[PDB]
Design a protein around this motif. Structure first.
Motif, mmCIF file in Angstrom:
data_model
loop_
_atom_site.group_PDB
_atom_site.id
_atom_site.type_symbol
_atom_site.label_atom_id
_atom_site.label_comp_id
_atom_site.label_asym_id
_atom_site.label_seq_id
_atom_site.Cartn_x
_atom_site.Cartn_y
_atom_site.Cartn_z
ATOM 1 N N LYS A 4 41.903 40.621 51.533
ATOM 2 C CA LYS A 4 41.951 41.053 50.134
ATOM 3 C C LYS A 4 43.416 41.250 49.686
ATOM 4 O O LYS A 4 44.190 41.885 50.402
ATOM 5 C CB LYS A 4 41.189 42.352 49.979
ATOM 6 N N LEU A 5 43.814 40.689 48.540
ATOM 7 C CA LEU A 5 45.210 40.883 48.090
ATOM 8 C C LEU A 5 45.176 42.144 47.234
ATOM 9 O O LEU A 5 44.410 42.222 46.261
ATOM 10 C CB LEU A 5 45.730 39.680 47.286
ATOM 11 N N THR A 6 46.001 43.120 47.593
ATOM 12 C CA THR A 6 45.979 44.402 46.900
ATOM 13 C C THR A 6 46.996 44.687 45.794
ATOM 14 O O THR A 6 46.685 45.418 44.889
ATOM 15 C CB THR A 6 46.009 45.576 47.951
ATOM 16 N N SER A 7 48.219 44.183 45.869
ATOM 17 C CA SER A 7 49.192 44.430 44.792
ATOM 18 C C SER A 7 50.377 43.493 44.959
ATOM 19 O O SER A 7 50.593 42.934 46.048
ATOM 20 C CB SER A 7 49.664 45.876 44.784
#
Lengths: 122, 122
Positions: A4-7
């Protein structure tokens, strides 16, 4: 199981990093996060921007970033007293006026290095 | 009453936007958010990246971005099957190996346009 790409953190560019940092902090209210000689990070609220060194001036002149903000008119007032609002007839750091664009109500700011950063009302 | 900065979006650059978008979506798993002819946005999970057109190749060759991720080894596995892991002896899109840096455990990826994006383990 999937990654998951978070920021994300935009990277501005400058021939002179130290001066770019002085500007974003002493004048725009960001704090120093870390400062190496050719790479730095500044922070304000939930936004971090990195500043990286380059040799060709055309890079910073073509570097962009988009930042979202709650209380755009107030950011505009806070910054209009330390940055010129005559965006065209100015050579140094400058700010355009608030206007509507496809991405929302916004204004852009050019820093001393040449980076152009768009601030948008959340 | 003080303005709060809430989030930022890095802007990658390309001489060929359409191809940059095809790569980030068809190969890396991002979705098209909006696509104009010289400006686009791609998204994956909580991360949005904008892609902007430029004429000089040296800009994309100097453009950077940092992205944080949960499940870095798995992103690395997911992407190693569509992007070369021979980062040096390669001309097109490539990925370096996972290594420790001051900002954390990470790997970098160069896209077809030349942008270099660092992915860091949260």
């Amino acid at each position: 199981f999937m990654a998951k790409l978070t920021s994300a953190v935009p990277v501005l560019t400058a021939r002179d990093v130290a001066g770019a940092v002085e500007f974003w902090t002493d004048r725009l209210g960001f704090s120093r996060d870390f400062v190496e000689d050719d790479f730095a990070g500044v922070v304000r609220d939930d936004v971090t921007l990195f500043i990286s060194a380059v040799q060709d001036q055309v890079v910073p002149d073509n570097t962009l970033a988009w930042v979202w903000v709650r209380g755009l008119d107030e950011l505009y007032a806070e910054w209009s007293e330390v940055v010129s609002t005559n965006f065209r007839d100015a050579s140094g750091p400058a700010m355009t006026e608030i206007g509507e664009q496809p991405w929302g109500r916004e204004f852009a700011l050019r820093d001393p290095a040449g980076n152009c950063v768009h601030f948008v009302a959340e």
